Design a protein around this ligand. Sequence first.
Ligand SMILES: *[C@@H]1O[C@H](CO)[C@@H](O[C@@H]2O[C@H](CO)[C@@H](O)[C@H](O)[C@H]2NC(C)=O)[C@H](O)[C@H]1NC(C)=O
Ligand SMILES: *[C@@H]1O[C@H](CO)[C@@H](O[C@@H]2O[C@H](CO)[C@@H](O)[C@H](O)[C@H]2NC(C)=O)[C@H](O)[C@H]1NC(C)=O
Ligand SMILES: Cn1c(=O)c2c(-c3ccccc3Br)c(CN)c(N)nc2n(C)c1=O
Ligand SMILES: *[C@@H]1O[C@H](CO)[C@@H](O)[C@H](O)[C@H]1NC(C)=O
Ligand SMILES: *[C@@H]1O[C@H](CO)[C@@H](O)[C@H](O)[C@H]1NC(C)=O
Ligand SMILES: *[C@@H]1O[C@H](CO)[C@@H](O)[C@H](O)[C@H]1NC(C)=O
Ligand SMILES: *[C@@H]1O[C@H](CO)[C@@H](O)[C@H](O)[C@H]1NC(C)=O
Length: 724
Amino acid sequence: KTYTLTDYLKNTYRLKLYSLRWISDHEYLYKQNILVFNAEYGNSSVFLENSTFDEFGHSINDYSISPDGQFILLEYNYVKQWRHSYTASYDIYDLNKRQLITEERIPNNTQWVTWSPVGHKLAYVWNNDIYVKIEPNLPSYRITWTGKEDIIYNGITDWVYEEEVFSAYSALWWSPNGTFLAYAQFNDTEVPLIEYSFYSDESLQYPKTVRVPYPKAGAVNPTVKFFVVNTDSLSSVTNATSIQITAPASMLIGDHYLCDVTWATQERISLQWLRRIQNYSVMDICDYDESSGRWNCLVARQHIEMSTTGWVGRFRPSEPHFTLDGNSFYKIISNEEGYRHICYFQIDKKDCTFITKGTWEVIGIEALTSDYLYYISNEYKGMPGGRNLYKIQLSDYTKVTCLSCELNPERCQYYSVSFSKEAKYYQLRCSGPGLPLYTLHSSVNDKGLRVLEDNSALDKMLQNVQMPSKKLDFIILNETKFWYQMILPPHFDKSKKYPLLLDVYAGPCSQKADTVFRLNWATYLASTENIIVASFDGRGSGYQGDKIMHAINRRLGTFEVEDQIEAARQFSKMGFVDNKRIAIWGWSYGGYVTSMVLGSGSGVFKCGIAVAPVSRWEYYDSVYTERYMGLPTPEDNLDHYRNSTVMSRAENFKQVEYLLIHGTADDNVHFQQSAQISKALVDVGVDFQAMWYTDEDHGIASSTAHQHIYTHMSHFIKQCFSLP
Ligand SMILES: *[C@@H]1O[C@H](CO)[C@@H](O[C@@H]2O[C@H](CO)[C@@H](O)[C@H](O)[C@H]2NC(C)=O)[C@H](O)[C@H]1NC(C)=O
Ligand SMILES: *[C@@H]1O[C@H](CO)[C@@H](O[C@@H]2O[C@H](CO)[C@@H](O)[C@H](O)[C@H]2NC(C)=O)[C@H](O)[C@H]1NC(C)=O
Ligand SMILES: Cn1c(=O)c2c(-c3ccccc3Br)c(CN)c(N)nc2n(C)c1=O
Ligand SMILES: *[C@@H]1O[C@H](CO)[C@@H](O)[C@H](O)[C@H]1NC(C)=O
Ligand SMILES: *[C@@H]1O[C@H](CO)[C@@H](O)[C@H](O)[C@H]1NC(C)=O
Ligand SMILES: *[C@@H]1O[C@H](CO)[C@@H](O)[C@H](O)[C@H]1NC(C)=O
Ligand SMILES: *[C@@H]1O[C@H](CO)[C@@H](O)[C@H](O)[C@H]1NC(C)=O
């Protein structure tokens, strides 16, 4: 048998995880029941029994233990908002007493909750205001009084910061020992609202108009203010005093962003700011003052990160990782030859020394200790799509060990890692090319303690089913290596011609050609429908240097789009591809590229599918768009904004078969965008196929809708490829 569409839609073959929460330097949790394992022995005693909350009345969505392990916080009444943001009711359970707290509880509809990094201090955000509980039973101190729905955000992010800047809803940051609580405040007063209909249940007679403060390219952005409050000196008589840390002079000159908040030590905080034109960023190191009780950021402590050839950082400037004393830090910056590597900065010095070098990039700094710095890079065998954990010696930078390279070179080439509190032990997470392999290691002698999850249960199931393989190779364009990957059908024959579907994302810093193992839509197409599904990382793709990544700076919808067309052209010359049946599909940014590729009138692609695509950049949000495009004004980059629209390629769709799909409640890429494509195709007399998904957002992640879309796409693809 083969991996069917039903197999994918109904999760027939499930990949087992081993998700763990580190609690101390040698202990971690796991849900079977809630067990607490040991890194030393492996013995696990139950921390909270499966049905300790049998008589609770509510379905517990998530749990949160305080760092001292005295209290557990229970999350229920989950009402998802955007990608990360949501609402939930909260209850605190005493572990040393075994009972819920009934007096002065966390109110219904709480936006965010967080324990202090040590002890059991609690900070929550309700109605856009910040509250603090020193004890779980005592009443909370209201920190901010400015919070206003859709307008003022305290300790929580507005739409744009959540999606594009912080990849999180929370804008609260406890100091390492929970003394201070650092928070941002967003102001959307003048940010225009995106409005769309929400039809809701059949029972709703008149559709709801959802109105979200959302800054489209070049529109009035939110403004950010930072504050730090002293939770140890809070009063229940007078209002909490919140010390402001104003952005540097070089940022207040115009529009800016708060892009990073990292605590250095107990009395030292680092803030990274970014100009609206995102090629200049500055880090303020701010120390706490004694008798004045304020925060000072010495101008000589300012470290600038900029780019002449593009934008600063990959999506944002990388975070700093401070040494224990906080007088030095390590962060990832692009070097002189364009490659991103770890630089060792001195708090007082302007220059930094690169501790890593080469034609490959560092993905992230994982752990910093007294002796070693741990990082993940794609250095192994020069494969940008690989991931390996590396140890580097601080006293000598030439002393670099690979902790995951030679563990299992065959099945493991894509690693992520989870270090314990003081990095004494780490959990390695293998994601491909073989089945996912979760292992636990001791960082002292680097020995392998035990296999946590090998996915043998899945392995035996898949031995029976005809599975597709992955080819991960590179082509040479203009004397430069460009990596592609192919999900090859089972019993792959080189002499037989195959239909090829080109899976596309192609966004700036994208990587679609990697060593990860995945069971997805492509797996079915290769397995059951015998379709080669291929992905290609061209100009604009990440993890290969700024030379390749910035190639599409201020020029979105050009070089990355030509490169998908060129990839498909290169694949035709490979011999095993049917050039009469080549298709292309993408989601989000991929949808835009798909559209653009089909609108190019190249002739390569017979048909395509764009899902929730960007139609033109003035419709997408400011932060992401202007990072690559700049402002849509005559004196900046308006010419290319106008030239890079899919609507202006409408005429060309007469040569191709198009399926446009979009959700009606898409907060991310508004249905507007597809509405303008459809209208454009309609005006030039192009027959195409469409599909809206009522009340579905950008993920189109409803169980029934997910199933529907993929089934609908499968028909389109099969119909296009002459498959019954
Ligand atoms: C957030 O910004 C808004 C708009 O920029 C501020 O609203 C202004 O407030 C001042 C004084 O309070 C008034 O004189 C202006 O007329 C207001 N402008 C508009 C159009 O509303 C608002 O005060 C800021 N919010 C806070 C308090 O942080
Ligand atoms: C702490 O600050 C809040 C907000 O400024 C105060 O509450 C306001 O009180 C003033 C007059 O005392 C009223 O004009 C506002 O309508 C109140 N806003 C609300 C409902 O929060 C509060 O009194 C302050 N606490 C003290 C006494 O220091
Ligand atoms: C496919 N894809 C993205 O499109 C994407 C996008 C993106 C780009 C343009 C339009 C909509 C989105 Br969402 C963004 C920007 N919000 C992002 N941060 N990541 C993306 N990824 C990982 C991603 O995989
Ligand atoms: C493992 O056994 C030791 C016995 O000394 C004990 O300290 C530890 O709590 C046990 N681990 C768990 C949490 O089951
Ligand atoms: C939340 O509201 C419900 C009724 O809508 C109520 O029963 C519950 O006690 C509330 N939660 C608290 C403790 O505020
Ligand atoms: C937390 O750190 C602060 C600031 O350095 C210090 O005043 C205090 O001693 C620490 N608190 C505790 C309880 O360790
Ligand atoms: C930022 O980009 C603009 C054009 O987009 C350019 O004129 C300017 O020089 C850049 N700034 C820096 C610091 O390189």
